[PDB]
Design an enzyme around this catalytic site. Structure first.
Site, short mmCIF file in Angstrom:
data_model
loop_
_atom_site.label_atom_id
_atom_site.label_comp_id
_atom_site.label_asym_id
_atom_site.label_seq_id
_atom_site.Cartn_x
_atom_site.Cartn_y
_atom_site.Cartn_z
N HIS A 1 -4.15 -8.38 7.94
CA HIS A 1 -3.41 -9.64 8.00
C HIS A 1 -1.95 -9.31 8.33
O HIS A 1 -1.61 -8.16 8.62
CB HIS A 1 -3.58 -10.49 6.73
CG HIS A 1 -3.02 -9.90 5.47
ND1 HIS A 1 -3.74 -9.05 4.66
CD2 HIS A 1 -1.83 -10.09 4.84
CE1 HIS A 1 -3.01 -8.71 3.61
NE2 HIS A 1 -1.85 -9.33 3.69
N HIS B 1 1.04 -9.39 6.78
CA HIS B 1 2.12 -8.94 5.90
C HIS B 1 2.47 -7.48 6.17
O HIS B 1 1.74 -6.76 6.86
CB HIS B 1 1.73 -9.10 4.43
CG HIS B 1 1.69 -10.53 3.99
ND1 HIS B 1 0.87 -10.97 2.97
CD2 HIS B 1 2.36 -11.62 4.43
CE1 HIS B 1 1.05 -12.26 2.79
NE2 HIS B 1 1.95 -12.68 3.66
N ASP C 1 2.43 -4.79 4.21
CA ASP C 1 1.54 -3.70 3.80
C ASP C 1 0.38 -3.50 4.78
O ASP C 1 -0.42 -2.56 4.60
CB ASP C 1 1.01 -3.90 2.36
CG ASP C 1 0.51 -5.33 2.07
OD1 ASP C 1 0.94 -6.29 2.75
OD2 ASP C 1 -0.30 -5.49 1.13
N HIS D 1 -6.08 -14.78 0.23
CA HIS D 1 -4.73 -14.22 0.04
C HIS D 1 -3.78 -14.71 1.12
O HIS D 1 -2.62 -15.03 0.85
CB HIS D 1 -4.80 -12.70 0.02
CG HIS D 1 -3.47 -12.03 0.17
ND1 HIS D 1 -2.67 -11.72 -0.91
CD2 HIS D 1 -2.80 -11.60 1.27
CE1 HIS D 1 -1.56 -11.15 -0.48
NE2 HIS D 1 -1.62 -11.07 0.83
N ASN E 1 2.20 -12.89 -6.78
CA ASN E 1 2.75 -13.62 -5.65
C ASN E 1 1.61 -14.07 -4.74
O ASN E 1 0.79 -13.25 -4.30
CB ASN E 1 3.75 -12.75 -4.89
CG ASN E 1 4.36 -13.48 -3.72
OD1 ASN E 1 3.68 -13.79 -2.74
ND2 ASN E 1 5.64 -13.81 -3.83
O1 LIG Z 1 -0.24 -9.34 -3.82
C1 LIG Z 1 -0.22 -8.56 -2.83
O2 LIG Z 1 -1.30 -8.28 -2.24
C2 LIG Z 1 1.07 -7.91 -2.33
N1 LIG Z 1 1.15 -7.21 -1.20
C3 LIG Z 1 2.39 -6.80 -1.03
C4 LIG Z 1 3.11 -7.26 -2.13
N2 LIG Z 1 2.27 -7.94 -2.90
C5 LIG Z 1 2.65 -8.58 -4.15
C6 LIG Z 1 3.03 -7.48 -5.12
N3 LIG Z 1 1.82 -6.75 -5.41
C7 LIG Z 1 1.37 -5.67 -4.78
C8 LIG Z 1 0.17 -5.29 -5.37
N4 LIG Z 1 -0.08 -6.14 -6.35
N5 LIG Z 1 0.93 -7.06 -6.38
ZN LIG Z 2 -0.63 -9.92 2.10
ZN LIG Z 3 -0.89 -6.92 -0.34
#
Ligand SMILES: O=C(O)c1nccn1CCn1ccnn1
Ligand SMILES: [Zn+2]
Ligand SMILES: [Zn+2]
Length: 231
Positions: A83, A85, A87, A148, A179
């Protein structure tokens, strides 16, 4: 043992062998004042490697490539981001500079551009509707519907019954939604049932962040999502 968030300094990447020809990659990154771990997938694609998702940032993704060369020694030739974002696409420009052809759905490419994130070069056709599946080398790409995020994909490795759930699948120890700014909370349980119905034989389930489990992670994630909705 699977590496944990405290064991990986920001900037380093671990590889974890799940099965013959299937590894997860684990990195760590700061986000709103805390450091979180993050999972991606690596799958042997003949004499090449298929990468699922960046390592959350340009510097982590360069370390990811270095660890792959050191430990596996086959060329990463394609990458799929599941996706839009950071990460998932943060590091796509390092991938591209290293010779990797980068891929994502048209929706993900568009959302990345709108968010100002890095943009995979190539569009993945055949994933525009919930329930769509396509083959991509040694894996199946599946769009379960919004969860998500609206664009999130999951990946399945048939040879090993490995399901990479991405950020739509929470790890067992995660009990709060956290989040969910870009989430469709209403559709998320529906999307998870499509995953369950399509991959009932998955033996290894890998969340976007944290420890791997089995199909219990699907029911677990619906439980968390629904609790966040009832309060
Ligand atoms: O929720 C997610 O998938 C996410 N990805 C990147 C940032 N977040 C939020 C913070 N987080 C990471 C893992 N767990 N929470
Ligand atoms: Zn994400
Ligand atoms: Zn994530």
């Amino acid at each position: 043992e699977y590496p944990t968030v405290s064991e990986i300094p920001v900037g380093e990447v671990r590889l974890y062998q799940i099965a013959d020809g299937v590894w997860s990659h684990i990195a760590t990154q700061s986000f709103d004042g805390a450091v979180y771990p993050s999972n991606g997938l690596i799958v042997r694609d003949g004499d090449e490697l298929l990468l699922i998702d960046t390592a959350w940032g340009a510097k982590n993704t360069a370390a990811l490539l270095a660890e792959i060369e050191k430990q596996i020694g086959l060329p990463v030739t394609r990458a799929v981001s599941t996706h839009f974002h950071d990460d998932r696409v943060g590091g796509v420009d390092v991938l591209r500079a290293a010779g990797v052809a980068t891929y994502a759905s048209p929706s993900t490419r568009r959302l990345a551009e709108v968010e100002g994130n890095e943009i995979p070069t190539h569009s993945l056709e055949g994933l525009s509707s919930s329930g769509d599946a396509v083959r991509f080398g040694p894996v199946e790409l599946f769009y379960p519907g919004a969860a998500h995020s609206t664009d999130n994909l999951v990946v399945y490795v048939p040879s090993a019954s490995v399901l990479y759930g991405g950020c739509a699948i929470y790890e067992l120890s995660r009990t709060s939604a956290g989040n969910v700014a870009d989430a469709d909370l209403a559709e998320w349980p529906t999307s998870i049932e499509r995953i369950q119905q399509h991959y009932p034989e998955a033996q290894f389930v890998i969340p976007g962040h944290g420890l791997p489990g089995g199909l219990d992670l699907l029911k677990h994630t619906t439980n968390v999502v629904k609790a966040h909705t009832n309060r």
